[PDB]
Amino acid sequence: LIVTPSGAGEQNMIGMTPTVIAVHYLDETEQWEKFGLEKRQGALELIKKGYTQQLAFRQPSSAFAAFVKRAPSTWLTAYVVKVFSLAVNLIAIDSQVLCGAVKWLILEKQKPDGVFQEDAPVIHQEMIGGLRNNNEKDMALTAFVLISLQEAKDICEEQVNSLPGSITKAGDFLEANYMNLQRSYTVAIAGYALAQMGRLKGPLLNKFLTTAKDKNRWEDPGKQLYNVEATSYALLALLQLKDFDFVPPVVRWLNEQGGGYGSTQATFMVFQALAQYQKDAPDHQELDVSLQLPS
Amino acid sequence: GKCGPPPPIDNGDITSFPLSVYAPASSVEYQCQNLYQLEGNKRITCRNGQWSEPPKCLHPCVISREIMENYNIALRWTALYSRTGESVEFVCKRGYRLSSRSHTLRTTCWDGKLEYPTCAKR
């Protein structure tokens, strides 16, 4: 077939993504009844397999790369943190693994002004969604990594005393440069990261809200998938703000839009966003998990 | 005489996973964030239920783009952050002359403090 790289430490995470986020979605919306509760247990074992397999790509630093002889990726390590965080009450996640990865990010990859830097890009660039785009990478990657740190905060605050300060520093950098942002993608991902901290207010909030088109989506010219991802981030930001009036058209647009090549991020983010929408929003609209959780 | 969890430091952390309780004469070490400089003994020791003093993390300097501009200077050997203790070299922008003291084009970053030279139109 086609010649393509085989970075298994990345490819296992691509494989793990649908099962984890599907289980997340069904747990959060409490919809296992319709889907079939008997299926949950097998999904849990599949997640456990993915997790256990990922451990072999955990390097002595606690960071992750596609290959054990390749330098660890900042993005991949943060993605692992985010995925493993969603799984902590689904299976036994070793805290040293999760919190070790968090601490490496903080002690090695964060720059003095709060920015997170990638020194060894993932080989499978399709798995990183909108991030693949060149510009505003310092803001976009810092937001991505900060979001992962936010997911690990409660689990790891006790193991990693430096965590809250790293979060605040990354938050400082996002806030200081948000107004100069031009891409809708960055506006949405950084908007979510800031909103989670209660730091998306004033002119920043205005920019975020007014960056949308037709008050229903955040999009930039290019791959449609990146807009589905951006808009899911924006939906999550709206839910942090509890701005339930702006919400309905966004959810309609998202639902009117899942898998294949380059769909890791879209799949993860859509299911996360729509899951939280149904969990939070009073009298939510009616909204297929079968594709993520086959047989 | 047991100790309890080692103390936090700004811009750094211990190199081990923390314990709930720490035996007498046990030790842990600290590491600073990237580009920060450890000042003091990086190791602390438990004894008589108390920890010895933890190190400090000296700030790097974040080279202003641009206070460099309103001082009419740029970086020589162009390629920024510099570590505590590193020297950084500047040049006057074209058509300008050094208006600060004779030596001020080479300066040393220390704990977040950097003294910029200034130039003025000739």
From Swiss-Prot, chain A:
This is Complement C3d fragment. Changing E33A: No effect on binding of C3d to CR2. Disulfide bonds join C99-C156. The lineage of its organism: Eukaryota, Metazoa, Chordata, Craniata, Vertebrata. Changing E157A: Impaired binding of C3d to CR2. Changing Q159K: In AHUS5; leads to impaired binding to the regulator CD46/MCP and resistance to cleavage by factor I. Changing A92V: In AHUS5; leads to impaired binding to the regulator CD46/MCP and resistance to cleavage by factor I. Interacts with CFH. Interacts with CR2. There is a cross-link at A8-Q11 (Isoglutamyl cysteine thioester (Cys-Gln)).
